[PDB]
Write a protein that binds this ligand. Sequence first.
Ligand SMILES: *[C@@](O)(c1nc2ccccc2s1)[C@H](CCCNC(=N)N)NC(=O)[C@@H](NC(=O)[C@H](Cc1cscn1)NC(=O)CCc1ccccc1)C(C)C
Ligand SMILES: *SC[C@H](NC(=O)CC[C@H](N)C(=O)O)C(=O)NCC(=O)O
Ligand SMILES: [Mg+2]
Length: 241
Amino acid sequence: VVGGTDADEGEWPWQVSLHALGQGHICGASLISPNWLVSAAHCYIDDRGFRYSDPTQWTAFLGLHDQSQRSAPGVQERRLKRIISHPFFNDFTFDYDIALLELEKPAEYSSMVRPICLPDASHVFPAGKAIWVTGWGHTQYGGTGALILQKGEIRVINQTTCENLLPQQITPRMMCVGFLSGGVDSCQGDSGGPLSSVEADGRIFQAGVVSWGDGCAQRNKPGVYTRLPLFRDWIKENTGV
Ligand SMILES: *[C@@](O)(c1nc2ccccc2s1)[C@H](CCCNC(=N)N)NC(=O)[C@@H](NC(=O)[C@H](Cc1cscn1)NC(=O)CCc1ccccc1)C(C)C
Ligand SMILES: *SC[C@H](NC(=O)CC[C@H](N)C(=O)O)C(=O)NCC(=O)O
Ligand SMILES: [Mg+2]
């Protein structure tokens, strides 16, 4: 997160850190039920050096605050038994950049571990609405990741404006969130983490998945996120959630 601040311990109890064997934190995720996480499909693509699509190569840390304190009280460690990347994922445009991760054993709900709410298919997150982004990613483009979980406040950007800022790259599965002036943005290592929106009764709903951007926090280059309401049915059909 660029331009953010330290989160409070337990402030985002749905935020998850995904570590690949021998590599440390690679991507974020969100807890949506006792058995299921939402993340980004592009984190789980094989390359010639490592089989990122293989669920046995991963560990999920729930209730984590400080990346250097992965055994602290309240932190839960879980393996994965399945990774479901969206079948329409496009590895050139990163259309449909969303995945579902099945925990090998259920999370235990606590003051530090709690699911985010999922929006109904017909809900619209309106232009201009305040949204929170969280993660352990870089605090500057090309910089270094944060040990302590970071939070930042950004805003939904009109879809036509989004398309014009990034021509020939914004599909209807994508949403721009941030500022045209730059300054606050997600960044490398935040991929797969949730957008958190405070809704009408103060409960937090997931508004998107961190996906990509041109650099980080640059003027006229807002972060691009995978939408959530569009996938409510896909999630229900695949997880029962
Ligand atoms: C996410 O944290 C990551 N996923 C992985 C997976 C494997 C290893 C490492 C990482 S980091 C980030 C989140 C970035 C959010 N950015 C903003 N909100 N501003 N996702 C990525 O890094 C994706 N790649 C990009 O965003 C790249 C970075 C870059 C290289 S040069 C300037 N910026 N963006 C582009 O290349 C822009 C052009 C483009 C071409 C084609 C498709 C999309 C964009 C991810 C790895 C694809
Ligand atoms: S909608 C998902 C979360 N709801 C719960 O966790 C309910 C469980 C309680 N223990 C209960 O109902 O008694 C939720 O609301 N997440 C967002 C938030 O702001 O907490
Ligand atoms: Mg604690």
